[PDB]
Ligand binder design. Structure first.
Ligand SMILES: [Zn+2]
Ligand SMILES: [Zn+2]
Ligand SMILES: [Zn+2]
Lengths: 193, 78, 48, 105
């Protein structure tokens, strides 16, 4: 009866007889057969492929997120949120560790601060490097900074995503959206990646 | 006494190899070619067998043990 | 009981896609089923 | 939020030329310096955070309906502890009436 596998008193017959769309199916399933007949003989090969195809959206790896009205310049000391002013310590390390990922010249006054759930990163076996590539491959209109992947408990992993000015140049002719509205729309896109 | 000691050892090995069945210590999931992972030294015929070739079970486990220990402690907190 | 002991020491690591609560419940349901041996005392008490 | 000095009302926040400006219904306008740079935030897994159960974990040793366990308390050397299992990951915490609490908290 649990969500996603609801096969309780008549639901599935109602999904068939009423011709309910896929969006209204509470017990939809699907069977996939491996392309290589040799691979389907081995359980471990089928086990890792099964875990390969499992929707892990970027939202479920997040414990909490903060939307900040900040711009980042390497030299100029811009204003920063007092509760997150300690983030600058690992920002300097990121700048000296990536001589090719320099901050752009069109960074907007909008910052998204992310605190990754390290427990979910362990159970789902998701590395920090994999998350960075996935977000940078899907969102070219953002600049992303991250802390160091730490193996010591008590120190979190921080993802910082800076919105570029082109994020609003996408569609700002529709003036019925203040810059706060687009930024909230962007973070919804980032979390659902 | 022998039964409980052997059960402790076997259960510890089973838990370790069930955690690192698809999970790879080097991050992500296992990349298996030639029956062996490329990121680590895991073999296919060791995940579900710890008796036929004990030495190869006592090496892989000896490689990522404390690692495994830190992750186990981290999950059981907060 | 020994599944609970594994829980106390934090020795229950769920697989990918399962929470510890859901994996613990799965282990308990499997461990609390009568074996096929249950009819051995039943059939010894009856004359077919 | 920003509370107006004059009338103690909830001021409306807008954004002008790279700055956060609060304007009130009484005409008073101020600009936040550092503590108002928080547009929005959300916290996930609110049903199993440590701040959720602080009161409950504190009261657990005195609640007679909690499950006990035969283990020695390392502080007062009492031979029983109170065992609680919180969260979706089934985190086990042992607590005692003397203030001892496993996980070092
Ligand atoms: Zn591997
Ligand atoms: Zn006012
Ligand atoms: Zn005590």
């Amino acid at each position: 009866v649990a969500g996603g596998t609801n096969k309780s008193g008549i639901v599935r017959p109602q999904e068939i007889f009423s011709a309910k769309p896929v969006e209204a199916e509470q017990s939809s399933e699907m069977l996939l057969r491996l392309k290589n007949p040799e691979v389907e003989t081995n359980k471990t090969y089928a086990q890792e492929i099964a875990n390969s195809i499992e929707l892990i959206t970027f939202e479920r790896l997040i414990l909490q997120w903060h939307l900040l009205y900040e711009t980042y310049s390497s030299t100029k000391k811009n204003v920063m949120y007092p509760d997150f002013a300690s983030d600058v310590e690992w920002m300097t390390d990121f700048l000296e560790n990536h001589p090719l990922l320099q901050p752009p010249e069109d960074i907007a006054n909008w910052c998204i601060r992310l605190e990754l759930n390290k427990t979910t990163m362990i159970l789902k076996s998701i590395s920090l490097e994999s998350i960075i590539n996935s977000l940078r491959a899907k969102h070219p209109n953002t600049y992303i900074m991250h802390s160091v992947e730490n193996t010591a408990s008590g120190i979190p992993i921080i993802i910082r995503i800076y919105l570029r000015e082109s994020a609003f140049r996408r569609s700002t002719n529709t003036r019925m959206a203040t810059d706060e509205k687009i930024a909230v729309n962007v973070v919804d896109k980032l979390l659902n990646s | 006494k022998k039964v409980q000691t052997a059960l402790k050892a076997s259960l510890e090995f089973n838990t370790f190899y069930a955690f690192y069945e698809s999970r790879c210590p080097k991050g992500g999931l296992h990349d298996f070619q030639d029956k062996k992972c490329v990121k680590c030294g895991l073999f296919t015929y060791i995940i579900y067998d710890h008796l036929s070739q004990p030495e190869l079970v006592h090496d892989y486990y000896n490689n990522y043990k404390d690692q495994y220990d830190k992750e186990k402690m981290s999950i059981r907190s907060i | 009981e020994e599944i609970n002991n594994r829980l106390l020491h934090g020795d229950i690591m769920p697989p990918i896609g399962l929470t510890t609560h859901d994996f613990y419940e799965k282990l308990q349901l499997n461990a609390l089923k009568f074996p096929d041996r249950i009819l051995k005392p039943i059939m010894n008490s009856i004359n077919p | 939020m920003k509370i107006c000095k004059a009338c103690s009302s909830c001021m409306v926040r807008t954004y002008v030329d790279g700055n956060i400006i609060f304007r009130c219904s009484c005409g008073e306008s101020v600009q936040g310096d550092s503590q108002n740079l928080l547009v929005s935030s959300k916290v996930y897994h609110t049903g199993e955070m440590e701040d959720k159960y602080k009161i409950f974990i504190k009261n657990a040793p005195f609640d007679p309906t909690n499950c006990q366990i035969k283990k020695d308390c390392p502080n007062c050397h009492l031979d029983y502890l109170t065992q609680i299992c919180i969260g979706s990951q089934k985190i086990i915490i042992l607590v005692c009436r003397c203030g001892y609490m496993s996980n070092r908290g």
